[PDB]
Amino acid sequence: IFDKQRRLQELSEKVRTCHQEISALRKALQEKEAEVLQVLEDIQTI
Amino acid sequence: TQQEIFDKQRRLQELSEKVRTCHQEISALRKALQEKEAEVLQVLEDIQTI
Amino acid sequence: QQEIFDKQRRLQELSEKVRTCHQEISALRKALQEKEAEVLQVLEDIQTI
Amino acid sequence: QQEIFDKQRRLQELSEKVRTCHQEISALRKALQEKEAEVLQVLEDIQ
Known part of the structure; x- marks a missing residue:
């Protein structure tokens, strides 16, 4: 049937x-996640 | 207590x-x-019925 | 007919x-979601440290 | 102390x-997405 x-x-x-x-x-x-991931990475980088 | 630490x-x-x-x-x-996804899942349920 | 079938x-x-x-x-x-929510708890527990 | 470390x-x-x-x-x-994409291509064919 149509x-x-x-x-x-x-x-x-x-x-x-x-x-x-x-x-x-x-x-x-993804961007917000990829961002907090970058922030955690920075926390080690201090 | 150094400045660099601070x-x-x-x-x-x-x-x-x-x-x-x-x-x-x-x-x-x-x-x-999970509201947009859920919404589409209900559409899918509608399509399943016919 | 077959077209209909x-x-x-x-x-x-x-x-x-x-x-x-x-x-x-x-x-x-x-x-x-559950994985996504597992992350969040980890994130909230990171802010507590 | 330098326990920040x-x-x-x-x-x-x-x-x-x-x-x-x-x-x-x-x-x-x-x-x-693959599955979402899948179910889209299914519908696109129905016409």
Whole structure:
């Protein structure tokens, strides 16, 4: 049925939308982690 | 009690406080992820149903 | 008709694959969080030192 | 006293533990993205 396909497109586009959010959010996370890691490294470097 | 010791100490405290700015940001950014992730998981559950 | 069947088949298969991704994405995510939370405790215990 | 150095040795032990935890996380992230990517390509084909 076409209706099922249409409903899937609604949801499918929606999951594409969320993922891109998830991605950049995840990029933001790595950076903050990679940062505290740099701070710990600096603490030994004092 | 030397000045150099203190200077390092001040830097040390600065670094410890900085671990906070990171803890907070990490900790809240982590919530934002597990809500966005969860949201998408529910969509997936909807797609599974049809 | 077969075109209709072919379509239904493909759709059923998709739901199954999506389910299996679901439970895996789900398990990974929970492994991450707990690991992610294990780090935080270490970080909070670093600030205490 | 100049026991700051001993605090530093202890800090080093804890930092090693988070560096190790972070090695896992990344590997877990790589798997999840692959899986997230997987389930995307599944949907893209459904039409």
